[PDB]
Amino acid sequence: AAPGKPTIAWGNTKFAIVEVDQAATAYNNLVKVKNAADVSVSWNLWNGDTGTTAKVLLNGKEAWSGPSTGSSGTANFKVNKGGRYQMQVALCNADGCTASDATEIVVADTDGSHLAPLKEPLLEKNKPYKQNSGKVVGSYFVEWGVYGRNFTVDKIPAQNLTHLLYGFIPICGGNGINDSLKEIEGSFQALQRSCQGREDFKVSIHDPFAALQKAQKGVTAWDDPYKGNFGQLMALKQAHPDLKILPSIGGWTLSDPFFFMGDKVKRDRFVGSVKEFLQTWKFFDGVDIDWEFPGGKGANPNLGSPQDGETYVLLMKELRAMLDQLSVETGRKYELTSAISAGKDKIDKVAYNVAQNSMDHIFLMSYDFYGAFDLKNLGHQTALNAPAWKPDTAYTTVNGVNALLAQGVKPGKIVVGTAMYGRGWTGVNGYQNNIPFTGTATGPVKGTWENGIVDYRQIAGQFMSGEWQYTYDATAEAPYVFKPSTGDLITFDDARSVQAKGKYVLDKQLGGLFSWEIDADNGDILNSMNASLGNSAGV
Numbered sequence: 001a002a003p004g005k006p007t008i009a010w011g012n013t014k015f016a017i018v019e020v021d022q023a024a025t026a027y028n029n030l031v032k033v034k035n036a037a038d039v040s041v042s043w044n045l046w047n048g049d050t051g052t053t054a055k056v057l058l059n060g061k062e063a064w065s066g067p068s069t070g071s072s073g074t075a076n077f078k079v080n081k082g083g084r085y086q087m088q089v090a091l092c093n094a095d096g097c098t099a100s101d102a103t104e105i106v107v108a109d110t111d112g113s114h115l116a117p118l119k120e121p122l123l124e125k126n127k128p129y130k131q132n133s134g135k136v137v138g139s140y141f142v143e144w145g146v147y148g149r150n151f152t153v154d155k156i157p158a159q160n161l162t163h164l165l166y167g168f169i170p171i172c173g174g175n176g177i178n179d180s181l182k183e184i185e186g187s188f189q190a191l192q193r194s195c196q197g198r199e200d201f202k203v204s205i206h207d208p209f210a211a212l213q214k215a216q217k218g219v220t221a222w223d224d225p226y227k228g229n230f231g232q233l234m235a236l237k238q239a240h241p242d243l244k245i246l247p248s249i250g251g252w253t254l255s256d257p258f259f260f261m262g263d264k265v266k267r268d269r270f271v272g273s274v275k276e277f278l279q280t281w282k283f284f285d286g287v288d289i290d291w292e293f294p295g296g297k298g299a300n301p302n303l304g305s306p307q308d309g310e311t312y313v314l315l316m317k318e319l320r321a322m323l324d325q326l327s328v329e330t331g332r333k334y335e336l337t338s339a340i341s342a343g344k345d346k347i348d349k350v351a352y353n354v355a356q357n358s359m360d361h362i363f364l365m366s367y368d369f370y371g372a373f374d375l376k377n378l379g380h381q382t383a384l385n386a387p388a389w390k391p392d393t394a395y396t397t398v399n400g401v402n403a404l405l406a407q408g409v410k411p412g413k414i415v416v417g418t419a420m421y422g423r424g425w426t427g428v429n430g431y432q433n434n435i436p437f438t439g440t441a442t443g444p445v446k447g448t449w450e451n452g453i454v455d456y457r458q459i460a461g462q463f464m465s466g467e468w469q470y471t472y473d474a475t476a477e478a479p480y481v482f483k484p485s486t487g488d489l490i491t492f493d494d495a496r497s498v499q500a501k502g503k504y505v506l507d508k509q510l511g512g513l514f515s516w517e518i519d520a521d522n523g524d525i526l527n528s529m530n531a532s533l534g535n536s537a538g539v
């Protein structure tokens with residue numbers, strides 16, 4: 001007679017190919033990449049002959065075999081592909097095999113293959129669009145927005161994007177290497193702890209709790225190996241396999257290490273660590289380089305060199321060569337992008353006409369033209385054109401685009417930026433002919449989260465009523481709200497100015513639109529980005 005039917009023992013059924021150490025703060029100890037997950041199964045036979053060979057089947061296919069030597073047994077084996085498997089134990093003898101009932105096991109991998117898709121409803125005023133225009137529609141999600149801003153990955157209107165950028169992946173380094181971090185409370189120290197035992201100029205994760213361990217929708221079970229932003233982004237990938245999810249390296253306070261990369265020893269180490277990062281976190285589709293800025297004038301007044309333009313071009317070439325190698329190793333397409341200043345003085349420090357051949361998209365940061373960092377010279381922070389009262393205005397979207405085009409940049413490489421936030425001053429005074437920008441300011445506007453900056457959501461909800469004037473400058477293509485009693489002035493993007501930007505992209509055959517930052521929108525801005533680029537409504 002064939003053996004009796006085995007009973008699978010109660011036990012852990014969740015295993016991981018990339019293991020996360022739950023009691024570690026250093027990136028080196030936090031994640032362990034393996035070739036395969038170590039899986040274990042046990043069984044009991046309560047009735048009959050135990051057979052002579054015991055087998056573990058995954059979807060009917062043997063993953064382990066051994067002699068059946070007792071009424072209880074244990075099998076330890078490796079599984080090298082993520083997913084969910086119907087696991088059975090079978091006991092075989094010459095008269096037949098008898099298989100247990102199936103027990104599902106989970107083999108986790110960083111592509112999210114073990115995760116149910118994160119298909120969440122659109123919130124606030126977001127409306128569904130199809131990504132059928134062929135244009136880029138991108139936005140940055142910020143790692144730290146899961147705290148005070150309470151904006152998690154399940155709130156991303158993901159179907160309305162082609163590109164989702166994750167700000168920011170840091171570059172390891174202490175004194176002299178990340179000094180700009182020291183201006184943010186605890187930020188420098190958090191990176192040093194993450195980078196303990198890790199060489200300078202390798203990438204890491206700045207807030208491993210937010211990125212990997214904070215409970216979030218769809219990743220709340222204690223033995224879910226990936227939680228936080230990364231876990232949710234994995235599940236988001238499962239729901240939207242065509243979404244490009246790019247890690248962004250740099251930003252305003254994490255850009256200092258780029259300035260040392262004229263040393264090819266450091267550059268090589270950085271490029272190698274980006275490759276390892278992408279082999280580790282398989283849901284990511286490439287890399288975004290947010291170096292602010294080649295040549296200086298970033299957060300750090302002690303950094304910036306005329307060599308930076310050559311360093312940038314070399315970095316883009318070597319990153320592309322690494323990504324090409326990754327691409328043919330995996331059969332995937334990987335993208336290389338960069339967020340760049342839109343000011344002509346900064347643009348002409350770099351030969352983008354050369355670098356463009358390595359790059360899929362240039363995210364032109366056509367915003368922060370004006371703000372509370374300058375209380376004397378006011379203007380539209382993100383306008384398309386110069387205003388009528390100052391047609392020679394240096395800092396406009398068109399002037400940044402024109403600088404790139406004059407270098408020889410192909411128009412299709414250029415993605416125009418929109419702002420999901422306003423910048424603002426207080427105490428504006430001494431202006432002429434009812435144009436508050438011709439005056440001067442006494443300080444920053446009170447901000448949503450920091451001085452001088454207001455979420456678009458708060459502008460729409462709070463500063464579009466009462467005493468606030470509203471004006472759409474049709475020459476600049478830029479709205480602004482003004483409270484005369486206090487001199488509060490805010491410059492921002494709205495649905496109409498975004499529409500002008502989208503129409504401009506289509507007319508000049510540019511690459512699309514991207515935005516900073518996705519948590520601050522109520523839907524109006526992203527809706528207009530999709531509509532103005534010719535994306536069809538619907539799902």
Ligand SMILES: CC(=O)N[C@@H]1[C@@H](O)[C@H](O[C@@H]2O[C@H](CO)[C@@H](O)[C@H](O)[C@H]2NC(C)=O)[C@@H](CO)O[C@H]1O
Nearest residue numbers: 252292340341342343365367368369370373395
């Ligand atoms: C366009 C331009 O050159 N103007 C400068 C601003 O860009 C710059 O502000 C900084 O802009 C970066 C994007 O270009 C932002 O990412 C960065 O957060 C921002 N920094 C601050 C402090 O807001 C300011 C520097 O303050 O100078 C303008 O000249």
